[PDB]
Design a protein around this ligand. Structure first.
Ligand SMILES: COc1c(NC(=O)c2ccc(NC(=O)c3ccc(N4C(=O)[C@@H](NC(=O)c5ccc(NC(=O)/C(C)=C/c6ccc(O)cc6)cc5)C=C4N)cc3)c(OC)c2O)ccc(C(=O)O)c1O
Length: 213
């Protein structure tokens, strides 16, 4: 019912959330209930149960948006504008904040092996500065790749510049530090979880980055 106000009926045919599926509903009942239980117990976001829960949240959310970042952004629009999303789904803004921070910890736990203490502390602080702007960029990268946009075109370079701004926001401006992050990406599959990125779109982006650099 709620999805009808936010997705076209064509989109509803491909949005798994809108499927009749008992297991999907049970899965989210568990994921929401377990998040609230950890929060009730004042579980820190860097506790292993929270990290594991948040990793599972992101896997499930990408599955149930059919890997479409524009469907993820649509859900976030919904959460802000639909009243009673707490009452309908159990998902609260405070719960998303918890999952967001726990998922960040899942990546900071890996970056710790690639960064020195100063770099890691910088990223722990600034990872959240512009985190919320990534889904919109990912959707635009998907569209550029789908439309066969030239990575060297002005608007392709606009996308590369946007990536750099968001990347430097969390990584800093030091070239040697940035090299560590890009090496970590190459070597750690988990660091591209919760991104809605595909190998095809990543390849397009890295071509656009190559032109820019
Ligand atoms: C690693 O760096 C790189 C990169 N990187 C990247 O490409 C990159 C790309 C993207 C990202 N990030 C993201 O995409 C990115 C994703 C997501 C968020 N997000 C959000 O959307 C916000 N809401 C949610 O989460 C949220 C959670 C739950 C729901 N549930 C529901 O609605 C419903 C209806 C449930 C339901 C329940 C019960 C029912 O009964 C029924 C229903 C809804 C919403 C909060 C956060 N946090 C934020 C961000 C990213 O991370 C920063 C990246 O790094 C590339 C190349 C190199 C190189 O070297 O070449 C490199 O180094």
């Amino acid at each position: 019912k709620m999805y009808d106000r936010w997705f076209s009926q064509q989109e509803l045919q491909v949005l798994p959330f809108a499927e009749q599926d008992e297991q999907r509903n049970q899965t989210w009942l568990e994921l929401v209930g377990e998040a609230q239980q950890l929060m009730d117990e004042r579980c820190p976001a860097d506790e292993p149960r929270a990290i594991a829960l948040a990793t599972r949240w992101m896997e499930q959310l990408e599955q149930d948006t059919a890997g479409r970042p524009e469907f993820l952004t649509r859900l976030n629009e919904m959460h802000a504008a639909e009243p009673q999303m707490r009452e309908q789904t159990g998902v609260t803004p405070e719960m998303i904040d918890f999952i967001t921070r726990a998922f960040a910890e899942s990546k900071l736990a890996i970056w710790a092996r690639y960064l020195n203490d100063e770099e890691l502390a910088f990223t722990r602080q600034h990872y959240f500065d512009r985190l919320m702007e990534w889904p919109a960029l990912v959707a635009d990268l998907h569209r550029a790749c789908r439309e066969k946009r030239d990575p060297a075109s002005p608007g392709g370079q606009q996308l590369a510049q946007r990536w750099l701004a968001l990347f430097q926001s969390y990584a800093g401006k030091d070239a040697q530090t940035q090299q560590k992050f890009r090496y970590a990406m190459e070597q750690e599959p988990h660091l591209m979880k919760g991104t809605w990125m595909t190998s095809e779109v990543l390849s397009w982006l890295q071509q656009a980055i190559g032109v820019m650099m």
